[PDB]
Symmetry: D2
Subunit: 328 residues, 4 copies
């Protein structure tokens, strides 16, 4: 595994947040989403009935994996991570296990994870995946229902509106039927997976944590796994903003990575125009790389599946400043 050595020198990567939440764009019935526009279903407790129907409008005419990767490559990013399934429970790939997915449920009728995976392979970029293994608002036994004693970017961590029976909920049902199967699907198809990013488990047993680890190992041996998953079930540690240099779970390979956004939201949002300046993006990348931390910078694709104009402008301007500085 010299995939470890490559990750040491990778430095820069593109993250993609895309789903049904992108269509609403941080706006619901004349009122604003939280800082996080992807959390909008939980924020307004939108019935799966209504939220799911967004799938019927999902027809991103200007989606183009080739261009998205081409941009990423031109900004010097060596890998591309993408959301296979967020908390909303909607898969952005052709899931055999659940028909609540982009291919089956939308007019678009195309596997986005597939196109990106291929585009990356052809452009010579590594391909990473992200999957919400705990939270699933579409699933009756969705995770988080025994972990609401803290506030969120929405309301509850689980779907407490469609399924108001915390006392008679059992995540084991959700894990065996959707989670473990869907993780197999994405790790089986879409060629070589170089990175796998998971959420901090809240309603997940140690068995279920170890299960996923083994599942990824058996299917994608060379795949580097994120620390969020389990304390003895990772390769590289994900540092979360407040864990950045001027408790700490040991990194035995000495691999570190920090996910960040260009504006204040991961999912796309009309009202969020607070785009980090070219200078800020370059300077933060510089700081993280100097402390041996990979910078995973997120683009939130819009309803037509385009990179927001200002997101592109600033990504390219940040590259220019970096290049100009490396000659000076």
């Amino acid at each position: 595994n010299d995939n470890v050595a490559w990750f040491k020198q990778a430095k820069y990567g593109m993250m993609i947040h895309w789903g049904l939440y992108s269509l609403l764009a941080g706006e619901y019935r004349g009122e604003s989403s939280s800082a996080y526009a992807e959390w909008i279903q939980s924020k307004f407790q939108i019935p799966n009935a209504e939220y799911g129907n967004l799938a019927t409008a999902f027809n991103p005419l200007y989606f183009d994996a080739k261009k998205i990767v081409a941009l990423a490559k031109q900004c010097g990013m060596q890998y591309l991570v993408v959301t296979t399934k967020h908390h909303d429970g909607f898969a952005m790939y052709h899931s055999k296990v659940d028909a609540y997915n982009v291919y089956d449920a939308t007019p678009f009728h195309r596997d986005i994870i597939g196109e990106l995976a291929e585009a990356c392979q052809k452009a010579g970029l590594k391909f990473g995946l992200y999957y919400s293994q705990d939270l699933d608002w579409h699933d009756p036994n969705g995770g988080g229902y025994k972990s609401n004693d803290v506030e969120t970017a929405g309301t509850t961590w689980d779907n407490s509106w469609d399924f108001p029976d915390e006392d008679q909920k059992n995540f084991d049902l959700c894990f065996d039927n959707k989670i473990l199967p869907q993780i197999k699907e994405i790790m089986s198809n879409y060629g070589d997976i170089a990175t796998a990013w998971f959420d901090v488990p809240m309603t997940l047993s140690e068995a279920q944590s170890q299960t996923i680890y083994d599942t990824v190992r058996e299917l994608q041996p060379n795949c580097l796994i994120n620390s969020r998953l389990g304390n003895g079930k990772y390769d590289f540690v994900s540092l979360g903003d407040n864990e950045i240099p001027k408790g700490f779970k040991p990194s035995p390979l000495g691999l570190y990575a920090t996910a960040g956004t260009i504006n204040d939201s991961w999912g796309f949002s009309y009202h969020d125009q607070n785009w980090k300046t070219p200078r800020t993006l370059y300077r933060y990348k510089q700081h993280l790389n100097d402390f041996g931390i990979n910078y995973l910078l997120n683009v939130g694709l819009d309803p037509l599946g385009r990179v927001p104009m200002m997101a592109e402008e600033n990504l390219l301007a940040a590259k220019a400043l970096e290049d100009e500085a490396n000659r000076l």
Copy 2:
């Protein structure tokens, strides 16, 4: 016609700019539209082939004429004007003459002009219409091709990219086949039409100007017609920002937007403050001018959050001031 008397005391009205241009939202291939996001097809000379295909994505799940009118009524607006067909040539009604329309060409498969017309009738608001009688970028013989000696919010006034033959163009073909017929359609259906707003003709004969006037008169007698159409072919005059302080009825109206674009746009967040909207309305009404304030509906057919907030805040300030 006491429709004249009502227009004198109308004061406030809602304008709706909605079409395929709303889906792009002032953004095309990583580059920004002009101040006017509705002019985006001309701005980037987008082939009718590509631009038209936007119709396939047009599925506004959260469109609701009832609510849009309810908002308008709550802000004190007495009439609602809507775009039947803009310069893009795409009809937002069920046009028998052209299949390039919301009902036939989109998954949505619904007559928006119809729903709004009905919603207005039931809510007790008058219903106005707007139609681009000159410019049509979808039509081979689209107007503006003999009037490019001045700059626009796009490139050329006409579709000079799909149809680059200015020398062998003839608008008479476009007028007889699409324009006059489509004006009949909207003025025939959708109940009583109280106002009709037209563009300044550039490539339109006096005959064609008088034709439309007579067509509207014959179909909608009570309908008040905008001055833009023709010098002896109107009831009320439209003042254009720089004309703010002959109308034989003594009727005047000024169209304005909440931000800087008529059509919806992501990057345009320059929403006029509640205070500005109220103060401008106050000024225009005090000089006997009707304020037609435009909402540019987004891809899901929603009133932009900040557009709603400011419209309602502007009403509050007006109400608070009328008690004080």
Copy 3:
């Protein structure tokens, strides 16, 4: 003390953040301050030599206590709290103990705390005070030097740049010579003090905490004291955003800003909408919590245009809702 009963029904109050930090306006040598523009001295570790010199530029021509209070009263705010001295150590009153103050050190040469105190009295508003009893970046033995094991809105909690000798620092020197004396000054002059807001002590002994409590009690008996000061040394509790849905009187209050900064800042245009301000006030008042909404005065001592607009628009919506 029916000052307790009044605080129960007070509901709305104005907060004022003003000092030398207001002149820089979240900007230093081509680079941005934190979310908190008042913390700018710590953020860039600006020498007291340089930062203090800002006093020479402090000449706010358009400062007017009368108008500031008049605005507050028109928005329905029943009391006005003001910064006597922030972490920067610069007093905004005529301090006999330290010449590092607005009256002595500036061309302005006027006691701002005085004018506001008077303006409030004449307008029929209660007058509150805020004093940084722990942190003082101007003082050699400024507090926070044994509490840097956590991150701030600047760099260190103390002035670690002018005075880099944490090992040979002693806060007792600072407390006896500046803090206790200056607290006496503000609580002695400027008429009746109805509220007193203090910071969470980090480098303050229980003795020093009790000292301040007794000092305020002896000088301003009717004055309600904030919970931040000491666990058995308050009347009302200050809830800090994340504490929103023991107080023996059953009194609670939450401080908030209109944008994301307390001190004024050019680049911070993220003004909470009229709707947001009203709705948050409504929520807090419904849960028996007083809303203390902060205005950060600009270099000329003006209420920022958008701060005023939104405060008045928020009042309008509240009034409109109380009739509806």
Copy 4:
């Protein structure tokens, strides 16, 4: 005069808008200025009594000609133009003719035009000047009083509030006593003047127009004069946005220049955060230079005499993109 040849290859220049209007910052008594924050005195018809008093607050601690020029030079700008006196009538130099100036009337007590002129000389940049030869709101017989039949960025073109006697006004009084003398002062001192930018005359006789031309010629022979001044009294033509390629006064030397701002205001303004993107600044410069037009890009200094943070960021980012493009 090979000053003509240098102007042909100059391409990029910095403009400085600074005065009493900068202290108000597009804000007066809770209400906003026009697009133009420098026009604020006319906008709210602020008495000379009140407006003039701003001089007492003018103490820009962080003003530094060296740094301003250093920035300009680093962005590749070959000359720096500055406002000696705008419409407000307030001179930013040590005027012997009028005590309504930065040196005499302010705590600052320093000649800004001087420091910049020197800073430019030492850094190896040419030095240009701008003077409002027609409009003067401080002068009783200020110009514009017979030209109010059109709307402005304020109210009237002249000071119609302090001096409401259009019928008994005579500009000849203003020209002989302030204008011609003050133009001599700035063209006599502050070393070599390479460029001189004037306003379109509205209330100025042909004699008075020719007078200024001759005055500049006699004092600064090598100085290139702007077309705005007079039809037979210039070297290079100033194109005003709507005169840019995809009536036209002939340019005999073939010299063209276009003034533009980074945001929508010339003078500094708090509420105007509409900063043209790095991409826009570079692309516009590219377009103008390709059509043989010099790009004069304006910085509006703030109350402390600093280049606004975002103005600097975008100027430097625009340089980076230009440099990156000239290697690619």
